[PDB]
Amino acid sequence: KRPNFLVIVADDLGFSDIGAFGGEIATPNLDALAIAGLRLTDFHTTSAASPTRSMLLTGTDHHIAGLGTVAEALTPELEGKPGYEGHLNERVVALPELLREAGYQTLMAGKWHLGLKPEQTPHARGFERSFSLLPGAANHYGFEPPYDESTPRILKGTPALYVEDERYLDTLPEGFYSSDAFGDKLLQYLKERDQSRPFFAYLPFSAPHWPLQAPREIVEKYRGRYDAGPEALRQERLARLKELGLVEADVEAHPVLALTREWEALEDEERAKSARAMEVYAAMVERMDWNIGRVVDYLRRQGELDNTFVLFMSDNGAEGALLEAFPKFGPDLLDFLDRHYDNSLENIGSANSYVWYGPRWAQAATAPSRLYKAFTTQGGIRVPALVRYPRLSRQGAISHAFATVMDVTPTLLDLAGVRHPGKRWRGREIAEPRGRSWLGWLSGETEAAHDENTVTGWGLFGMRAIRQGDWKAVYLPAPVGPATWQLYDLARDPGEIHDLADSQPGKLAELIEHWKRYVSDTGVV
Template sequence: MGKRPNFLVIVADDLGFSDLGAFGGEIATPHLDALAHAGLRLTNFHTAPTCSPTRSMLLTGTDHHIAGLGTMAETLAPEQIGKPGYEGHLNDRVVTVAELLREAGYQTLMAGKWHLGLTCEQAPHARGFERSFALLPGAANHYGYEPPETADRPGVLKVTPALYIEDQTFVPSLPADFYSSDAYADKLIGYLADRDRDRPFFAYLPFAAPHWPLQAPAELVAHYRGRYDAGPEALRQERLQRLKALGLADAHVQAHPVQASTPEWEALSPQQRAISARTMEVYAAMVERMDWNVGRVIEQLRAAGDLDDTVILFMSDNGAEGALLEAFPKFGPDLLGYLDSHYDNSLENIGRANSYVWYGPRWAQAATAPSRLYKAFTTQGGIRVVAFVRYPGFARQAQVGDAFTTVMDITPTLLDLAGTSHPGTAWRGRPVAPPRGRSWAGYLAGRDHAVHDAQAVTGWELFGMRALRQGDWKAVYIPPPAGPGTWQLYNLASDPGEVHDQARTQPDTLNTLIEHWHQYARETGVVLADSGPARVHDTGAAVPQHAAAG
């Protein structure tokens, strides 16, 4: 076997499809753009609707209902507690790509957000990573700032016993100059500098940006001052035109109409507009800072002579985040009151360590267009995400690839490229689930025109949202208020925006897909919550003065 490649997998948290310059965005992302343009930009890549389910699929190659994240640990419904696949952390029914690559002689390194277990026994070091620095929960202040613990603190904002762990040791405190994206890059650069050069490496860099709370260095936020003053719809139209110009969207694509109960931009007061635009400015600065840190890691690889020997995969873990957190029950009944008391969300302070804001459904849909909706939904806006892969050894370089792919394909692909394989149904004396994804090796080498054949089926479920895709046909079930609470049918080849429901005109096709979805649910152990979706989105709550109006 020839020289085995290194692997660098970079994950952005809640990044929108068109945020990067190479994918139509106006945000300054020169390092990621250079990698994307030199590689293969994937326009038909799919994840789970939210972060921890996607991460479980990425690292195991199988469905999140099998891997232990049937739903997010933070949103378990009573009827899901204790059920197989709903452990709230990576379970023992799966083996990770880090475990398998390490066994195959790779050095395994990680720095960033884990979100797959909160205890030392569930941390990255226990799932195959030789060196790791990890944020264990799903979100945290990017500067490490936390107000004093109080009785009225909303549940999801409560600090877990330990936020960060390095290898097997919990981190008792963070340095005064801590900023998440910088810290993760620092750690990975250090691990790479000290690595064992007799072995290839698998490096995993899952950022926590641009996940809320939206926070970024003030000097970067200033780069975007005034850039978003025309509002989210203006940005949406700009992005759509650039997607078309880049060949990443059909010239005649019909974008799904924006769904949001928040007021239109023109109906907002000048103060509300200023605050909303500022949240988007901070978001853009977070993305720029993430790109800068990717550039630092790339420079480390280049200086060490490793860059062209490294397969680089970049992706977002789901669509852009459009939820209004004040409408999310897990945050408690008085989230806004708590933030007013413990944070400074004045216009001048938004983006600083002691601010806590998000940007809302209209800005999110500027980034997911032409797709429908955003994170947490099984519509295309929630599961079709920005992704690219770069490696000089691939035949497909400096191209756009429209083959249907999923996050479950990553583990089989890395194992294939490393010259090893998944053990199948047993590993180290215990039963494990085989991958449901497929290797991209043949596609990347130019031998295959597709990864999944037209008859292959792929299912989704989260928070009661459901979907099933076979070829170009997709069935979608979205409960009220964001959907009709009935199955809808779309042909994504002609209608990528999921605008024209064909359920009535193609009933046989829809019924076939629904049957496939029930088979998928049986195979993966889906447990639907009788009480309905555990997460509420954009339900018409009043627009807060200090948070996102967009």
């Protein structure tokens, strides 16, 4: 009997935020799935939202699938390059397109980020029912600033732009909050389904992405929890990750890098507003979890949960960006926020606040990894992941087997009994997956879907990484790194701390060869 699929994606969720991944945040629904299922510690996305999402729905690399760089950063020197179209292109077929022709009902509620135009929406790319925020982010409550020439570029590119199927929405309902609206819509779609056939349900939240906003009654639950700051938090998370066996007891955490003032150097007002941002974030995660519970509990009561392959992942590392630090997100973002929002302590988290938590809170969640979102180090690309499907033998454990987002499409086609069509689909040439199906591994037949010779590449925002087995080389340009290849043995040094470039030039050499083939195979510019 063919399984259902429930693929749930958090937006900028960090590695140890969820209870079953070492966190203090209340996530009882996700915990129950994770502990019963398989937690992954070596599962990888890309370093940003739309690249990852392009891969998750294709089984190939973002440079092929249309998100060679993020759309919001395309220049005229890249526009025209194949795979840099700025949206999911027609050089790929998506997973829902393939399941839909094989009898699955394809259902989505959440953030898309794969295209703004009609012919690029979920309805156009294989979803029969969809309720979607098309851009990368937006106000969770739908409160919009004035849009004119003087509006910061980062706000202009994040309107609350929603579609349902083919209808671009004029207005949002009363009481709209993103995670609740997504929960509501996917539950509706599930209740209205044809019960004699399986479904592919896609639940990409916009939480916990900035602006950090959540229901006050949930924020209140975290009052005072983060008063000790982000370095005290990082220590609690590291200890708990070791206690749970998610990281080995000897692991050396990468040092925290930040241009901001450390907690103890902050004035009391500043501290209070930063802790409140973290209390808000925690509420965002809890309320996402609560909506997940609504979906999952419905399926359970229907007797469908055990027949549903449930995959949860974040889409990249925790978000450490200072949005004020990027002039191109302006002109003056902070002044505009100061004149149009209220970020006073007591308003933070509500519709007319606009905050992000910054590098220090972000690195508490990525530890022991190096850095955070938009870096090709482990901090930006190693994300929490779980699989709950009791029809698979490998459940109840923590697995450190290498995996990536590109493995999802081939795994789900496999379970559906559906063959990838090859190099041609709907009269056009298409790419075949670069990932590998997880079926043998999760069946207990092999110990991993990949091996010591597997080669995987990353490149975005000028950064690079190239990995074979557990050897990884990384390239961070100025001002963020030495603008040279650094080499790491991930099996001994997960924090990417000890550069082996000089002591293992032969291994670096080979990885640089692999990197050239990566660029060549996928069209990296």
